[PDB]
């Protein structure tokens, strides 16, 4: 029985070779493979396939391969690839990508993806399913920011803070075992995966290491607390012994040494460079050279992503997070000039497009936007596609390679950096069921659904007092996955191995799932996905002219962007 591709794409979603435009951007993603069998597609509804005695098996119990949730006809976009498949979720963990259904009456059904009485069906046809975004740079300032992340498909927040405190407003640091314990207790009410970073400063090992023993998932070295080489040495030693990641916010003033001194202090050890470009913070002006080292994992905050006409003017007055500046003082005005360099931002755009910068982050409420990581990532992708044109590996007029490269910048690379890749980061079997469903016209702007631990945690849903869920006002809303004790089962609180072994979750009475931070000091730049490029970056100390392999790096700012006024009221 013939079916034209249009009707098939309308009914079950685009198949092999069918391309989908991402939001209002100019990026087309083409399906590479399909795991379903034609004519045996699984769908739910009255008179549809998934029924007892039909594509749903009514014989086996829960323990006999029957899933707990099946996402049907999903369009998986992941660093692994872009392909159509059905997702099986059991016990809150992804237990299969393939063809789910009834093995008795269907062909090619994945053996562990039997649809049974315990299965709950979610129709993902016509939607793009992505892994929950990981945010490694989060200033915990406002409890309302969590929803701001959830509305943009972010499921993990890594960082420190105790609220609207000056140290928290400036640095992602939860200083001290007591504050770490208090924030860990507070995280029981946040419907999001949380990782807490401690203060990686001090001349002695013990003050830093007691924070890790208290439950810290990592360390942050900020120039506000003093980014001396002694602090870097002690923090890196503690991280190596405890197997946790260290984030560095280098010394902008170059007070205790230039970038070379910081590199010597690091001594080839694995470190995570926050806002490696420099505008957010770092060694003025040659901090971006850190992006060229194999032992450095570079990230970049969103406000400079991408290069726009208003980026230069906006960023000048937002510098007040670090310390306040007066427009008539000769020194602090000079501080502003050497901090925001348009050449560095223009080069950072291309570095992101060239796979040199590996990750993306918000660095929220501290010269960063909480709910624009994915939005600005795809805006940068579209702008670089328009300017630089298609990449070398692209083919068939599709942007599959660019999509894979840019999706890794906020899904798997942060997870690998923090060592939480074994649990979250990508849509793979055995990983936590953190999924985001986007409508293709709202992809990267508003998340249609956010499922955490196999239960829908956030939804763009309409009036709660109507006959059906669709009528206006359609807005983001917390779902049943964030209500009551369920909020303890759908979220993970990543902590250090030593804290977990010492019984910190039991001592503090934490009810959330506990994730182990591991495999952090054995990784490097080559461990990044689609962004494992190491080179030499020359930053001119005089004109800030950024050069790579002898060629200049610059781009023209764009006045208009996709994922813009077309979507947002303000």
């Amino acid at each position: 029985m013939k079916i034209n591709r249009q009707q098939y794409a309308e009914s079950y979603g685009p198949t092999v070779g069918d391309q989908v435009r991402l939001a209002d951007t100019d990026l087309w993603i083409e399906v590479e493979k399909d795991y379903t069998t034609y004519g045996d597609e699984a769908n739910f509804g009255g008179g549809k396939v998934l029924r007892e005695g039909m594509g749903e098996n009514g014989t086996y119990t829960r323990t006999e391969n029957v899933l707990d949730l099946l996402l049907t006809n999903a369009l998986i976009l992941d660093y692994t690839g872009i392909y159509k498949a059905d997702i099986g979720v059991k016990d809150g963990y992804i237990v299969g990508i393939g063809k789910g259904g009834n093995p008795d009456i269907m062909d090619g059904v994945t053996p562990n993806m039997i649809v049974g009485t315990a299965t709950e069906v979610i129709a993902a046809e016509g939607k793009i399913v992505t892994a929950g975004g990981i945010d490694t740079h989060v200033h915990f300032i406002n409890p309302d920011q969590v929803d701001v992340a959830l509305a943009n498909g972010i499921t993990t927040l890594f960082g420190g803070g105790t609220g609207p405190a000056e140290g928290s407003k400036a640095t992602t640091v939860t200083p001290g075992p007591w504050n770490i314990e208090k924030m860990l207790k507070s995280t029981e009410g946040l419907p999001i995966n949380v990782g807490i970073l401690g203060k990686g400063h001090g001349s002695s090992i013990a003050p830093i290491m007691e924070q890790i023993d208290a439950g810290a998932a990592g360390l942050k070295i900020h120039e506000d607390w003093g980014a001396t080489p002694a602090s870097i040495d002690r923090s890196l030693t503690v991280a190596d012994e405890a197997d946790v990641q260290v984030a560095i916010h280098s010394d902008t003033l170059n007070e205790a040494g230039f970038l070379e001194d910081t590199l010597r202090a690091i001594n080839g050890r694995v470190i995570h460079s926050f806002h490696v470009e420099g505008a957010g913070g770092g060694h003025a002006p040659d901090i971006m050279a850190m992006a060229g080292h194999p032992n450095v994992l570079p990230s970049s905050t969103n406000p400079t992503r991408p290069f726009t006409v208003n980026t230069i003017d906006e960023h000048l007055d937002m510098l007040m997070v670090c310390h306040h500046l007066k427009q008539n003082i000769p020194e602090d005005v000079a501080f502003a000039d050497s901090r925001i360099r348009p050449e560095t931002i223009a080069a950072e755009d291309i570095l992101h497009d060239l796979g040199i910068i590996s990750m993306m982050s918000t660095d929220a409420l501290a010269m960063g936007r909480a709910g624009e990581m994915v939005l600005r990532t795809w805006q940068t992708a579209d702008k670089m596609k328009k300017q630089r044109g298609p990449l070398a590996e692209e083919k068939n007029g599709s942007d599959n390679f660019r999509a894979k490269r840019y999706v890794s910048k906020y899904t798997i690379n942060p997870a690998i950096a923090q060592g939480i890749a074994h649990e979250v980061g990508s849509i793979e079997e055995g990983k936590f069921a953190d999924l985001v469903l986007w409508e293709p016209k709202f992809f990267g702007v508003k998340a249609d659904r956010v499922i955490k631990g196999g239960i829908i945690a956030y939804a763009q849903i309409g009036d709660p007092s109507a006959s059906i869920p669709t009528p206006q006002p359609v807005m983001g809303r917390r779902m049943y996955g964030t209500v009551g004790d369920l909020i303890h089962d759908t979220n993970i609180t990543f902590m250090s191995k030593s804290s977990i072994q010492q019984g910190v979750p039991a001592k503090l009475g934490l009810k959330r799932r506990i994730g182990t931070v591991k495999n952090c000091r054995n990784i490097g730049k080559k461990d990044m996905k689609w962004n494992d490029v190491t080179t030499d970056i020359d930053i001119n100390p005089e004109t800030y002219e950024v050069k790579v392999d002898g060629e200049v790096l610059t781009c023209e700012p764009v006045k208009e962007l996709p994922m813009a006024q077309r979507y947002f009221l303000f």
């Binding site: 029985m1 591709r5 069918d18 034609y38 045996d40 396939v49 005695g53 008795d104 009456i105 293709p440």
Partner: protein
């Protein structure tokens, strides 16, 4: 150069559903007084009793229609429907409780169908 957010650019050609399967064409009538819609993947020998057709042809077969679609039978009307073989282990459990096992046991299925008076059993 018109741009539409989230629009598909589908490929060329068609796609054949249930490829490489045996196909049959049977005549099905509705002798009841109410409309009857049959799903795509339901075993065809266990469909409503009021449906008149060669029930032996419905064993191990289902409607060869796009998944999620249904075939409608109005009262007092006849259609030509294409049936395709089932897949996998070829076992049917539930529905009308006619098979509850492998579909290869034909004569037992027809005996059970005639016990409850399904129309079209020889």
């Amino acid at each position: 150069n018109y741009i539409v957010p989230g629009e598909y650019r589908v490929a060329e050609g068609e796609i054949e559903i249930n490829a490489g399967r045996e196909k049959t064409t049977i005549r099905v009538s509705n002798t009841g007084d109410r409309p009857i819609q049959v799903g795509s993947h339901i075993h065809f020998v266990e469909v409503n009793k009021e449906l008149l057709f060669d029930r032996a042809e419905g064993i191990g077969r289902r409607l060869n229609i796009p998944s999620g679609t249904a075939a409608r039978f109005e009262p007092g009307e006849e259609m030509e429907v294409e049936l395709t073989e089932l897949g996998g282990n070829r076992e049917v459990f539930g529905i009308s409780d006619l098979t509850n096992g492998s579909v290869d046991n034909k004569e037992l299925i027809l005996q059970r169908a005639k016990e409850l008076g399904y129309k079209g059993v020889e």
